[PDB]
Amino acid sequence: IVGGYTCGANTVPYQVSLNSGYHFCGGSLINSQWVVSAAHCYKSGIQVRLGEDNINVVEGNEQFISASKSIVHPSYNSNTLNNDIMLIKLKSAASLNSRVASISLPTSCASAGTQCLISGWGNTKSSGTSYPDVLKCLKAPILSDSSCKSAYPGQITSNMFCAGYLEGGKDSCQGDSGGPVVCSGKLQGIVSWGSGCAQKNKPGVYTKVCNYVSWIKQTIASN
Ligand SMILES: NC(=[NH2+])c1cc2cccnc2s1
Ligand SMILES: [Ca+2]
Ligand SMILES: [Mg+2]
């Protein structure tokens, strides 16, 4: 997250860190046994870490659970990143408490102009690399689809939306992939891609979760 702030320990209780010996992607807890992340974060051997704030210090509120199965969307295209969403089932159910909570799925899609909260442990520099140990947050609005499409011609599909600031300065970045975009208490997006980070006229692109609620509900009920 570039141009963001320190969230504060466990202020984003649904945020998860996917670890394969090191943190490589974020995700969101949707219920005690399931996590949603980005399909491009797929790896074999994932351990999900819940209740984290500093990912390099065991502070007492973490739950480390291995994944039993991962399901990448049937139509994920790694070349275009269309349908960049995946579900991860935990080996054991997590224990929900104040610090570990799940986030709700949307009933409808959010409108351009809606402010959201984006969080992650990704890079904090636009031209440079500095990875933080604690969770960073960024409040950003959903942008109109025309500003999204003019920034990325021929690359935006109806399963993606842009959020951020066209002036640059504030944005999600590498290491934030798979993490949450929560607007009005619902999970509306997943950090997916972009061009550099916090550059002018290159906002971040997010998977549009409201288009996958049926697939999510159906898949978790049958697995
Ligand atoms: N919001 C951005 N500028 C992002 C760029 C990338 C690049 C790779 C992975 N994730 C992201 S997010
Ligand atoms: Ca920790
Ligand atoms: Mg994240």
Catalytic residue among 37, 53, 84, 176, which? Answer: 84
Note whether 52 and 140 are same-domain residues: no
Domain co-membership, 221 together with 189 = no
The method of structure determination was X-ray
Q: How many C-beta atoms surround the C-beta of residue 138 within 10 A?
A: 26
Residues, CB-to-ion distance under 5 Å, ligand 2: 52, 54, 57, 59
> Is there a contact between 194 and 172 (Cβ–Cβ < 8 Å)?
yes
Report CA dihedral (55, 58, 61, 64) to the nearest 10 degrees.
70
32 and 5 co-located in one domain: no
Which residues have C-beta within 8 Å of that of residue 31, sequence separation ≥ 6?
102, 220
Measured CA to CA, the distance from residue 151 to residue 147 in angstroms comes to 6
Q: Are residues 184 and 108 in the same domain?
A: yes
Q: Do residue 119 and residue 98 come from a single domain?
A: no
**How many Å apart are CA 48 and CA 17, to the nearest integer?**
6
What are the residues whose beta carbon lies below 5 Å from ligand 3 (ion)? 26, 120, 176, 179
Resolution (A): 1.4
Is 77 in the same domain as 155?
Answer: no
Residues spanned by the domain of 195:
1-12+103-210
Q: Are residues 96 and 115 in the same domain?
A: no
The residues, any chain, with a CB within 8 Å of residue 214's CB and separated by 6 or more, are none
**Bridge partners, 159 (sequence order):** none
Task: Give how many domains the chain has, as a whole number.
Answer: 2
Residues 156 and 195 in one domain: yes
